[PDB]
Amino acid sequence: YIMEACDDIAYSVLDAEDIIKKGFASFHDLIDFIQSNQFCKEDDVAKRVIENCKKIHADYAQQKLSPAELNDMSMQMFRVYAIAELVDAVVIAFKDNINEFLNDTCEIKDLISCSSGKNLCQALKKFDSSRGYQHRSVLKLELEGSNYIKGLMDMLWLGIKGRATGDTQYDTPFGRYVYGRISENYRRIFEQENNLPACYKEAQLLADAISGMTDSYLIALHDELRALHQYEC
Amino acid sequence: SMHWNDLLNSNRRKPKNKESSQDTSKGRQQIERDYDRILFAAPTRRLADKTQVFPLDKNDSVRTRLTHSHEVANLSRGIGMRLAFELEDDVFKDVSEDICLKRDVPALLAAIGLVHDMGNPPFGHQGEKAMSEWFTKNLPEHSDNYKDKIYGDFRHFDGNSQTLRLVTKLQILNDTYGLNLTYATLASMIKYPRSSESDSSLWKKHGFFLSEKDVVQDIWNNTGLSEGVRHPFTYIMEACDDIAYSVLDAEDIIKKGFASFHDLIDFIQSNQFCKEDDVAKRVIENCKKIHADYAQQKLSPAELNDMSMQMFRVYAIAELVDAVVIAFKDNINEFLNDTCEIKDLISCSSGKNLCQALKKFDSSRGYQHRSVLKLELEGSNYIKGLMDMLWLGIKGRATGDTQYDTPFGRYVYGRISENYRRIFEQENNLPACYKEAQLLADAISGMTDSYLIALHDELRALHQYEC
Amino acid sequence: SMHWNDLLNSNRRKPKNKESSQDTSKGRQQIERDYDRILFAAPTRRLADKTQVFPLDKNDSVRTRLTHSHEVANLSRGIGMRLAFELEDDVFKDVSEDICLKRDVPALLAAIGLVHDMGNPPFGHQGEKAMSEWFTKNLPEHSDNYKDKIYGDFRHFDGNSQTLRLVTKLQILNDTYGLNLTYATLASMIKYPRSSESDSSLWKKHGFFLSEKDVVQDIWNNTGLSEGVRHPFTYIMEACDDIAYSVLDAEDIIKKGFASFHDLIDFIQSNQFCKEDDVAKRVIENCKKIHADYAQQKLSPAELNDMSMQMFRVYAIAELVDAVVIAFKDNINEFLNDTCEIKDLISCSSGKNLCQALKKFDSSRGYQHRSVLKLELEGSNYIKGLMDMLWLGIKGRATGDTQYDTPFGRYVYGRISENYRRIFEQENNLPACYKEAQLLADAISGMTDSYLIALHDELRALHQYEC
Ligand SMILES: [Mg+2]
Ligand SMILES: [Mg+2]
Ligand SMILES: [Mg+2]
């Protein structure tokens, strides 16, 4: 529960900070979104964060700063205040509900919802979704990554399917090379004799191969095998 | 039969609420505010990126949609000032003193001239054809889904209906009011007062879509017009548009080098109907008289051709505008009748032969040039490819079928402008297939040439996996 | 002291000849004919290819020179209609009945608004700087050839003087009359009524070149103005230009994503002079009132920002126009005095603080953006390279020295427009170095950004052998 609460706090705060840094929004936009949010109008944590942010922003505009620098350090202060408040709320909620967490019949979905920073975290998640996750560039790169992943998965399945069931459509040179390109440990685990169904083993091999790759590695492998798949297509 | 009081109605469709501090009207008339709204609208600025006939990338001072619209607006404003300052007694009779003609008529004519080509599809007139062809292939008439005549709105897509939709309903705010223009302006925007559902011989094309039908009815109820009856100022706007077409397209043809001033002079002189036309004779004589003195000075052939065609433009525009004004003044009673059957104002004027000859010259020399045809084919290919690519993500969104749930389909749907999708997702009485086709038409019509090409290339790059 | 009869002179510099069949005036006033001449001029169409502040290649609906000129013309026309239809008694007194104010004043203001940025060099204001810098390096002040103050016309090159030259002398026909505008229009074009030879503290920049000095004198003799005295309508034109700058540049900044509506609201609220300004307070209150209702509906953040800034533009333009009109009406007697010392109309109005804050916001957010600075540097490099490359073929053509006789120099000279070279080769009293520098300035100023880049690349390719 503590790990999930920390992950959610990091998501909600640092993604908003990255959104402001990338120029998809501004500090004043986030302040207005928090102030006008339905559940954050009366939240004590949100009120304190907004007041502290404005108090620091007045003194911050006193000095001679560029708009980018002002936005950056204003969002740094917002990050500090929000992280402090959310961490304190999460710790208090965990301390208060420690008996329920230690029970064998615990039904709490998440620690944040039981804390006082629930509204602020929800508003930050909504802001991140509306401004950052649904941005045009983000959607375009998501589509590109989906295309890359699906192409690589089809190209690997051309050489993986049938390796355990018994059928031998993988014996093409491209299939053998594709199988050889997979990491050795994954194939060693796949070739082991266990009680898993053959189709399950093949699909698990593909999942392990795909999940272990980075973006650059996945793109490079996809391009290389696309170049090498020209004859069989 | 019709009264100028109803034809010049300054009321707006949106009901009145607003404190005095929010009053932005100032000393401006309502129709002047409509003109200002049209000028400051984003599509007006986007019109600069749309080609009229010839490519705009070359620095040959060709006229785009924005320049043509401004020229038409200027001509309409000049005609309006002539009507309101000199021919007021002959034209405007029994007009209430609450209407300031000197401030409304020129502003109204300029506003309707500026907005006449604001909702047209990109890539020029060919674009419309392409759209129609695409719909004719993708909304089959024999199919039960697209059997009704309403889908003709898309099989015979027209820029005027899309312009009315864009100025009345197609805005960011879905208030069904758009720019909230006055009733007189909206009535003058309707070029053909009929829909595809109705069958008429006076008007070939339809002037509004089914979705705007009720709105059009409201306009009629607030203007005194009816189905098949055209607002009197629409004739003036169409005459100005035709004059601008015939003259400035010829000027652009001469500038681009597809012909010369002497070629145009010979074509006009040898034309069957312009051999005895007084207007054509006067234009030719004035052109030759200026050209003799013009060749007296030391000028390059390009410079001589350019300024000779400038003089030709001046003389032709003056003669055609005078003829159009005279024809409108003479036939004012017929225009105000509820049973007016005049097709266009130019045909009733003395500049009919000159305008027809100029249109024939433009068609033979400019519109059928090899480069123009090649770019028209390229634009048609771009439009059809983009339409197929968007239909991959649009079809089934309203009917119920779920073939659009592919990642490419979702991204394609998300690439469409938010206001178009907001209108499409609204719950109305339109058929689902009609709503989907209207969404596609709105998406395609609102794009410029550069934007359309960029989107087509980007989505073609992103469509590689699913192909 | 000055009379509106002389300030609104409808006569033209070109002496009258012409049969009745050649009369193209029709029912148009002379100033209306001037507006039509300006609109149909080739530089007016070429203005669409020149960037105002931001690049025009992107389809972000940014405003170019043509759009900005049309907006300024519309604002000036609105102010003129307000003056001629409502404030006629307060402003126009002792005006002869032969002058139709309702048809001349709006037309005059629109014409001077449309032509105010017609002769400006490409690549925006930075272009001018680049030109000046180039001249400051290539026309040294210490040198005896370029020691006179007249060459300051090129060391402190201004777009207003080039615009006056282009509308008065720089045409295809070298008749020293150009478009042959009326005396009132020409008088209103002169923004700064002084030259570089004269030293004045009221006006920083010079308003006309040496070559046009006599022409300017003639204008004064036919208008009743004098050196250091500015036409009253020039104040209105400058106020409209400043309002359009301050408001529409901020709108373009918000549209381009360099800032947001809330950022502008906070900047206006926290501004030192806008904390207590009534106009700024009213604008902020109206913006927030509309923004609350606007956020009630379901809108994307981009759409909300866009229409919120549209509302801000509407309110700010209304308030600033009203303030400018009130200031002009109140100080009409001082403007008509021969010893007027008012620097600008906005400073005397109540919208001074709002306009200053908007200008500061535009400078801090838009004009000093990284992309804007990079494109300004690129344009400066292009302009300086083209100027050096042209000077290789221009220098010595009039003084007598023959270093230009290289094939590259001859081709470079031939690439210049024919009318510029025709004017340069004319035998006048201007010094040879002044004529050469004026030829270069006319060649550079008349080019668009795309044309300048294309010519620079082509001549760079053709200059490889001689380098
Ligand atoms: Mg995580
Ligand atoms: Mg047209
Ligand atoms: Mg300007």
Numbering used by the authors:
A (entry chain E): 236 to 468
B (entry chain B), C (entry chain A): 0 to 16, 19 to 468
Please give the exact wording used by the authors of the publication that reports this structure:
We observed strong density that could be unambiguously assigned as a nucleotide ligand composed of thymidine di- or tri-phosphate connected to a second thymidine base with a canonical 3′–5′ phosphodiester linkage, and we named this nucleotide signal p3diT (5′-triphosphothymidyl-3′5′-thymidine). We observed that p2diT was less efficient at inhibiting CloA dGTPase activity (IC50 of ~20.9 μM) and that dephosphorylated p3diT (p0diT) had no detectable effect, consistent with the 5′ terminal phosphates of p3diT being required for high-affinity interaction with the charged CloA ligand binding pocket.
Clover defense encodes an accessory enzyme CloB that synthesizes an additional nucleotide signal p3diT that suppresses CloA activation and protects uninfected cells from aberrant nucleotide depletion. p3diT binds to CloA in an allosteric site adjacent to the dTTP binding pocket and raises the threshold of intracellular dNTP levels required to trigger full Clover immune activation.
